[PDB]
Design a protein around this ligand. Structure first.
Ligand SMILES: [K+]
Ligand code: NI
Lengths: 482, 477
């Protein structure tokens, strides 16, 4: 959907994504070709970007250009900005909030001619249909086509464009939806937490705008206590009549046949239903295969299988699967893959085979999401992945006496990572040779010694103990650097 | 002893010590004023310094924690004709003065000037002098032996052996043989210090320069193999006089080689009892005030008593140019200024009350001794600092937050306590009201007064571990 942005905006977005992803230096030569533009475009984009994001710290050098600051800020800032300043997205969102308005109100709202609005809507619809089956219409003003696609597009859009704590929905306050969700939580099995609750509020508020104008999806709460208080809110706040049809339209996605809200019922269906048996079998063989290969002990196999099955049988119903501008899910999995490339590549291939064998959606967005799901549901995963990594041996010596070396060694052993094993030198003599033949990865001393091949030396004479702790801790993942 | 260096060299040295000590950004006016010199002088020192030590990098200097500061001291020793001549003379007792003129390409008149100047400087601290008729070093023998052993510890690297006349091995096997038959600690540091003291003492013993004042040793196993090495390697007869002269420092009346003997002397000698009483009240006072567990008080008292009653007998107490002991205490003092100020005052009072050496050199060394003999010091010193509370949130789902929380709680300092957000709603005010010190999130929130925010979207878990651990002593700040 980034083709809804202007050319300049699109290019600046990619420039910033590059600089946030890579901490290296970049000459304008390199930026020009990586971003497939001219050096003039790069220069113009850079100064536009400097002024738009003044907090971001840009150094220039003999080495080139880079952002120094990225660990204080976050790329969400950039998207938040390019969404906010985009004309096409703004119009689209205006239309979403104003079904039935006069086309002319849109022209007035955005200071554009009627012919310009028709050109814009034409461009918007062209971009949208590359991925989603819906379109904007001006006669009358509405969004039509595949209802599931529309609902997904906008909930995801709102999740990307607005900060987590923002509530940009003027027609619809959050409270009645919260009150409704409270009721829902008591009598159901949804996880109850801030993340899932925010996502549900966005899905539901998006669905209310559809429901208010009769745009419906093809498919206990009515007699829970409190229901009439909620039903009153909906009438008062939203002017909507809270009945069975509404409730069904709000939560349609959780009536998917192969979604199992109940874990125990899933496990029962595994025994009766040959499609479900097959899903279960594939996921069970995947999990065993990965567990044996990476020696990962897994705690609750069947619960994990249930979760993977469910995740794989939803399509454009959970947010952070498909993205508009910000592939946050994808970036998260890529960061983990940077640490553990072979592991992540193996799970992606197994899960891709799972999706393809069942003939469900097997796009990279779903492969990424499912892999992410497996990872984040797995206990002590990082411990297990690093289990073949021997401890780093650290020698500590003092030219004063051994009480000093022991004092330091004990202090560091206590405060620094248990990846390290700290020891003192126990022989009477020392020589370059006996240091070379020693097993140490790191040597800390307050006197100078010749370089010792394959040993990192920390000279500690001008370093206090606290600084030394910080310094040694920065080396805790040396083995991971192979 | 730095006044022995040329005025320029001396100033260049203090320049570098300032740079290495302080990380503060420096401009020429601060330097000139701090060093007490012209800006022309500072400009020229800087040029010279960069020329002499190319591997240093000035942007203020950014290399310091990674740089060979000993090489700095070596350099100034070597290029001091005064120090070089002093050393040559130490190794060449009885030579003709003309040999020194020849070796250093100087006239006899400038040699006599140099000697005068050396004697003038040394005399301020140590009561000995160099003589040219005949060529020898004379005066207080303990001062001489200390001066040179300490000089050699500062001028040469730990692994170097500058003594051409004397191999280390005969001396090693003597020490070995001594360790076996005694209570002396066996470790590389004390072993190196003893070798330097002894090799120094041998040069004195070889010309009959003796200290004014062991049976077992002469009938111990292997003594003849050792004594043969001494005769063949050093041209010296290993006897009761030599052994005594090699180890004189440890027959001090108030030095106690064994803890049990010290403790028996506490009951029968009123001076020893006084020493024990002062140290015991100091230790109790500091332990209660800073809540420090002292397990083996008597062992600590014994060590502090011993240390306080050696004078110019242990290296790294007084320095020639490089006050490494003092810098080590100053570094510790940077972290715990009040603790260190208290121990120094208590130990200064201990020393003054007994009327032993109470120089800042001895106060620094005794304080260093107290610190390094104490078990769990830093831990005890930080015990009132609460755990840092860390909140982890994800916009995806709570599994993600728990995955990250568990990984970070395992790998990061036990100074942290990681938790997830358990309420359904989040708001700026509930975050402000929360007790978290650090918030890790993959979604932007507004600044929350007094909370450090770490955003995680472009950071992998390993990077996140490094970033969190860098904050492990926030409270200490
Ligand atoms: K530890
Ligand atoms: Ni099978």
């Amino acid at each position: 959907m980034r083709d809804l942005l202007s050319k300049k905006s699109h290019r600046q977005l990619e420039l910033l994504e590059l600089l946030f992803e890579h901490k290296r230096w970049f000459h304008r030569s390199e930026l020009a070709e990586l971003l497939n533009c001219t050096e003039r475009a790069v220069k113009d984009d850079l100064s536009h970007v400097k002024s738009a994001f003044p907090d971001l710290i840009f150094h220039s050098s003999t080495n080139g250009i880079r952002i120094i600051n990225t660990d204080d800020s976050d790329i969400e800032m950039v998207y938040h900005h390019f969404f906010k300043h985009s004309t096409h997205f703004s119009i689209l969102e205006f239309i979403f909030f104003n079904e039935g308005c006069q086309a002319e109100s849109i022209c007035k709202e955005f200071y554009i001619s009627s012919s310009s609005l028709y050109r814009i809507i034409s461009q918007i619809n062209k971009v949208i249909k590359r991925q989603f089956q819906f379109e904007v219409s001006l006669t009358p003003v509405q969004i039509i086509g595949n209802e599931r696609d529309i609902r997904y597009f906008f909930a995801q859009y709102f999740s990307e464009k607005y900060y987590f704590l923002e509530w940009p929905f003027e027609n619809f306050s959050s409270e009645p939806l919260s009150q409704l969700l409270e009721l829902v939580y008591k009598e159901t099995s949804f996880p109850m937490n801030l993340s899932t609750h925010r996502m549900l509020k966005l899905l539901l508020v998006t669905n209310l705008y559809r429901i208010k104008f009769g745009h419906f999806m093809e498919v206990f709460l009515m007699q829970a206590e409190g229901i009439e208080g909620v039903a009153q809110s909906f009438e008062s706040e939203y002017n909507i009549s809270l009945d069975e049809e509404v409730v069904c339209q709000l939560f349609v996605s959780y009536f998917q046949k192969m979604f199992f809200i109940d874990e125990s019922l899933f496990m029962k269906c595994v025994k009766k239903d040959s499609y479900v048996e097959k899903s279960y079998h594939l996921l069970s063989d995947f999990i065993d295969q990965i567990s044996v290969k990476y020696q990962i002990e897994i705690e609750n196999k069947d619960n994990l299988i249930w979760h993977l099955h469910n995740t794989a049988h939803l399509y454009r119903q959970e947010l952070f699967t498909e993205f508009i501008l910000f592939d946050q899910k994808g970036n998260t999995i890529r960061n983990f893959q940077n640490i553990f490339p072979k592991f992540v590549s193996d799970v992606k291939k197994e899960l891709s085979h799972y999706l393809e064998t069942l003939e469900v959606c097997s796009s990279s967005m779903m492969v990424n999401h499912l892999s992410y799901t497996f990872i984040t549901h797995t206990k002590h995963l990082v411990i297990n992945l690093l289990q073949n990594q021997p401890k780093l041996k650290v020698l500590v010596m003092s030219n004063f006496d051994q009480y000093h070396a022991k004092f330091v060694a004990e202090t560091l052993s206590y405060y620094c990572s248990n990846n390290f094993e700290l020891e003192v030198w126990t022989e009477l003599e020392l020589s370059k040779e006996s240091l070379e033949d020693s097993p140490y990865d790191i040597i800390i001393s307050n006197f100078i010694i010749p370089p010792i091949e394959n040993k990192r030396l920390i000279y500690s004479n001008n370093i206090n103990t606290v600084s030394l702790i910080y310094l040694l801790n920065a080396m805790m993942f040396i083995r991971l650097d192979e």
